[PDB]
Scaffold this active site. Structure first.
Site, PDB file in Angstrom:
ATOM      1  N   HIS A  41       0.804  -1.218   0.000  1.00 18.15           N
ATOM      2  CA  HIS A  41       0.000   0.000   0.000  1.00 18.15           C
ATOM      3  C   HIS A  41       0.844   1.280   0.000  1.00 18.15           C
ATOM      4  O   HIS A  41       0.327   2.353  -0.314  1.00 18.15           O
ATOM      5  CB  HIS A  41      -0.976  -0.013   1.164  1.00 18.15           C
ATOM      6  CG  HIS A  41      -0.394   0.452   2.468  1.00 18.15           C
ATOM      7  ND1 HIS A  41      -0.074  -0.410   3.505  1.00 18.15           N
ATOM      8  CD2 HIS A  41      -0.120   1.700   2.918  1.00 18.15           C
ATOM      9  CE1 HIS A  41       0.372   0.297   4.531  1.00 18.15           C
ATOM     10  NE2 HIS A  41       0.377   1.573   4.195  1.00 18.15           N
ATOM     11  N   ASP A  90      -0.779  -7.303   1.630  1.00 18.63           N
ATOM     12  CA  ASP A  90      -0.183  -5.973   1.765  1.00 18.63           C
ATOM     13  C   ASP A  90       1.291  -6.111   2.054  1.00 18.63           C
ATOM     14  O   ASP A  90       1.741  -5.909   3.200  1.00 18.63           O
ATOM     15  CB  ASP A  90      -0.857  -5.125   2.844  1.00 18.63           C
ATOM     16  CG  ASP A  90      -0.390  -3.669   2.815  1.00 18.63           C
ATOM     17  OD1 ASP A  90       0.203  -3.270   1.784  1.00 18.63           O
ATOM     18  OD2 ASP A  90      -0.565  -2.973   3.850  1.00 18.63           O
ATOM     19  N   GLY A 192       3.372   6.434   8.737  1.00 17.80           N
ATOM     20  CA  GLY A 192       4.783   6.518   8.361  1.00 17.80           C
ATOM     21  C   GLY A 192       5.610   5.341   8.865  1.00 17.80           C
ATOM     22  O   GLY A 192       6.747   5.154   8.441  1.00 17.80           O
ATOM     23  N   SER A 194       4.178   2.258   8.407  1.00 19.79           N
ATOM     24  CA  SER A 194       3.812   1.346   7.336  1.00 19.79           C
ATOM     25  C   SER A 194       5.002   0.815   6.601  1.00 19.79           C
ATOM     26  O   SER A 194       5.887   1.569   6.195  1.00 19.79           O
ATOM     27  CB  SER A 194       2.897   2.014   6.325  1.00 19.79           C
ATOM     28  OG  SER A 194       1.600   2.115   6.849  1.00 19.79           O
ATOM     29  N   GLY A 195       4.982  -0.479   6.361  1.00 23.58           N
ATOM     30  CA  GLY A 195       5.991  -1.097   5.583  1.00 23.58           C
ATOM     31  C   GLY A 195       7.169  -1.583   6.401  1.00 23.58           C
ATOM     32  O   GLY A 195       7.899  -2.410   5.922  1.00 23.58           O
TER      33      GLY A 195
HETATM   34  N1  LIG Z   1      -4.877   8.311   9.514  1.00 19.71           N
HETATM   35  C1  LIG Z   1      -5.117   7.706  10.841  1.00 19.71           C
HETATM   36  C2  LIG Z   1      -6.111   6.560  10.726  1.00 19.71           C
HETATM   37  C3  LIG Z   1      -5.500   5.450   9.886  1.00 19.71           C
HETATM   38  C4  LIG Z   1      -6.392   4.214   9.863  1.00 19.71           C
HETATM   39  C5  LIG Z   1      -6.350   3.459   8.542  1.00 19.71           C
HETATM   40  N2  LIG Z   1      -7.185   2.273   8.660  1.00 19.71           N
HETATM   41  C6  LIG Z   1      -8.016   1.916   7.702  1.00 19.71           C
HETATM   42  O1  LIG Z   1      -8.165   2.559   6.665  1.00 19.71           O
HETATM   43  O2  LIG Z   1      -8.725   0.792   7.928  1.00 19.71           O
HETATM   44  C7  LIG Z   1      -9.273   0.326   6.680  1.00 19.71           C
HETATM   45  C8  LIG Z   1      -9.590  -1.002   6.603  1.00 19.71           C
HETATM   46  C9  LIG Z   1     -10.691  -1.408   5.862  1.00 19.71           C
HETATM   47  C10 LIG Z   1     -11.023  -2.759   5.809  1.00 19.71           C
HETATM   48  C11 LIG Z   1     -10.234  -3.702   6.469  1.00 19.71           C
HETATM   49  C12 LIG Z   1      -9.122  -3.277   7.191  1.00 19.71           C
HETATM   50  C13 LIG Z   1      -8.800  -1.933   7.260  1.00 19.71           C
HETATM   51  C14 LIG Z   1      -4.955   2.914   8.254  1.00 19.71           C
HETATM   52  O3  LIG Z   1      -4.358   2.221   9.075  1.00 19.71           O
HETATM   53  N3  LIG Z   1      -4.478   3.215   7.079  1.00 19.71           N
HETATM   54  C15 LIG Z   1      -3.132   2.717   6.671  1.00 19.71           C
HETATM   55  C16 LIG Z   1      -2.900   2.989   5.156  1.00 19.71           C
HETATM   56  C17 LIG Z   1      -4.124   2.572   4.358  1.00 19.71           C
HETATM   57  C18 LIG Z   1      -4.451   1.122   4.569  1.00 19.71           C
HETATM   58  C19 LIG Z   1      -5.679   0.742   5.116  1.00 19.71           C
HETATM   59  C20 LIG Z   1      -5.992  -0.602   5.297  1.00 19.71           C
HETATM   60  C21 LIG Z   1      -5.082  -1.585   4.919  1.00 19.71           C
HETATM   61  C22 LIG Z   1      -3.857  -1.204   4.379  1.00 19.71           C
HETATM   62  C23 LIG Z   1      -3.540   0.139   4.183  1.00 19.71           C
HETATM   63  C24 LIG Z   1      -2.070   3.449   7.466  1.00 19.71           C
HETATM   64  O4  LIG Z   1      -2.211   4.617   7.834  1.00 19.71           O
HETATM   65  N4  LIG Z   1      -0.998   2.720   7.715  1.00 19.71           N
HETATM   66  C25 LIG Z   1       0.133   3.281   8.481  1.00 19.71           C
HETATM   67  C26 LIG Z   1       0.582   2.302   9.576  1.00 19.71           C
HETATM   68  C27 LIG Z   1      -0.448   2.208  10.697  1.00 19.71           C
HETATM   69  C28 LIG Z   1       0.099   1.346  11.829  1.00 19.71           C
HETATM   70  C29 LIG Z   1      -0.968   1.018  12.875  1.00 19.71           C
HETATM   71  N5  LIG Z   1      -1.671   2.219  13.310  1.00 19.71           N
HETATM   72  C30 LIG Z   1       1.344   3.519   7.512  1.00 19.71           C
HETATM   73  O5  LIG Z   1       2.291   4.081   8.111  1.00 19.71           O
HETATM   74  C31 LIG Z   1       0.830   4.477   6.472  1.00 19.71           C
HETATM   75  N6  LIG Z   1       0.422   4.196   5.234  1.00 19.71           N
HETATM   76  C32 LIG Z   1       0.003   5.379   4.720  1.00 19.71           C
HETATM   77  C33 LIG Z   1      -0.522   5.753   3.491  1.00 19.71           C
HETATM   78  C34 LIG Z   1      -0.859   7.081   3.213  1.00 19.71           C
HETATM   79  C35 LIG Z   1      -0.689   8.061   4.182  1.00 19.71           C
HETATM   80  C36 LIG Z   1      -0.169   7.697   5.417  1.00 19.71           C
HETATM   81  C37 LIG Z   1       0.166   6.367   5.675  1.00 19.71           C
HETATM   82  O6  LIG Z   1       0.674   5.780   6.788  1.00 19.71           O
END
Ligand SMILES: NCCCC[C@H](NC(=O)OCc1ccccc1)C(=O)N[C@@H](CCc1ccccc1)C(=O)N[C@@H](CCCCN)[C@H](O)c1nc2ccccc2o1
Length: 247
Positions: A41, A90, A192, A194-195
């Protein structure tokens, strides 16, 4: 990482920073001289491969270091099953433009076999330079953060995620996923991170058990971080790397 501490330089030598147009967006884990594992992602289709960099051997992202090395990418290989956010798969193999040389500050983490089990409650460590609180960036000079987190089963995790859930904002932890963290919150990976690695201790070594994936709000109670299990992709990684870059 919220509720963690600054690591010491060299403690997590597989941790890499992934940037897009010069800004840190995600972590990754070095797994060989030319391959990094991160989250699919982190690599959306609209982004251009040439705008990514990987910084290895870094501790403070903002500080100059003669030990850190920066690379572009030759290949970005997300797992073919990753369709959208929340999908299984992912995970992405990143091939560096050129092989790096291992050093005191740049070393690979071991991958688990397909049937590696890391039991509930195991104290693993997640690391990164992501937010230290909801929408609060790690302050310069951005020392790598670490947080010890016990593993939480996907089953427990799913039930936690159901507590005070918004029916519109679903969260399902799939079979290729695990959680880690704390029911009361305040201690988790955040945006941030993530990954990056969830590194678990096994027989005196460290294995890449998980890849930071998703959660809810940074440090929210009942919302422990969700990680892609590297074991679920061990076969695919070995196959892909062996075919693409045989030793
Ligand atoms: N903004 C604060 C709130 C954030 C909550 C959001 N949750 C969500 O959308 O649930 C949906 C869902 C629906 C259905 C089944 C499950 C899940 C969320 O986690 N999104 C991920 C990125 C998107 C994503 C969403 C689902 C799966 C895979 C990827 C994110 O933020 N991952 C962070 C690390 C977080 C570490 C534990 N908290 C990494 O660092 C990063 N990836 C990013 C991508 C773009 C911008 C910033 C990012 O940061």
């Amino acid at each position: 990482i919220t509720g963690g501490s600054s690591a010491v330089a060299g403690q997590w030598p597989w941790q890499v920073s992934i940037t897009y147009e010069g800004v840190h967006v995600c972590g990754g884990s070095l797994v060989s001289e030319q391959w990094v594992l991160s989250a699919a992602h982190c690599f959306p289709s609209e982004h251009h491969k040439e705008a990514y960099e990987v910084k290895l051997g870094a501790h403070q992202l903002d500080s100059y270091s003669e030990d850190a090395k920066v690379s572009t990418l030759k290949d970005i290989i997300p797992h073919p099953s990753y369709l959208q956010e929340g999908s299984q798969g992912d995970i992405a193999l990143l091939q560096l433009s050129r092989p790096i040389t291992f050093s005191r500050y740049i070393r690979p983490i071991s991958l688990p076999a397909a049937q590696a089990s890391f039991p509930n409650g195991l104290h693993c460590t997640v690391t990164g330079w992501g937010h230290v609180a909801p929408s609060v960036s790690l302050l310069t000079p951005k020392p790598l953060q670490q947080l010890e987190v016990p593993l939480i089963s996907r089953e427990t995790c799913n039930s936690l995620y159901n507590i005070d859930a918004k029916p519109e904002e679903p969260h399902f932890v799939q079979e290729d996923m695990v959680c880690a963290g704390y029911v009361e919150g305040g201690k988790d990976a955040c945006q941030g991170d993530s990954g990056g690695p969830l590194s678990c201790p096994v027989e005196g070594l460290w294995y890449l058990t998980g890849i930071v994936s998703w959660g809810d709000a940074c440090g929210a109670r009942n919302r422990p971080g969700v990680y892609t299990l590297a074991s679920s992709y061990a076969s695919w990684i070995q196959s892909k790397v062996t075919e693409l870059q045989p030793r």
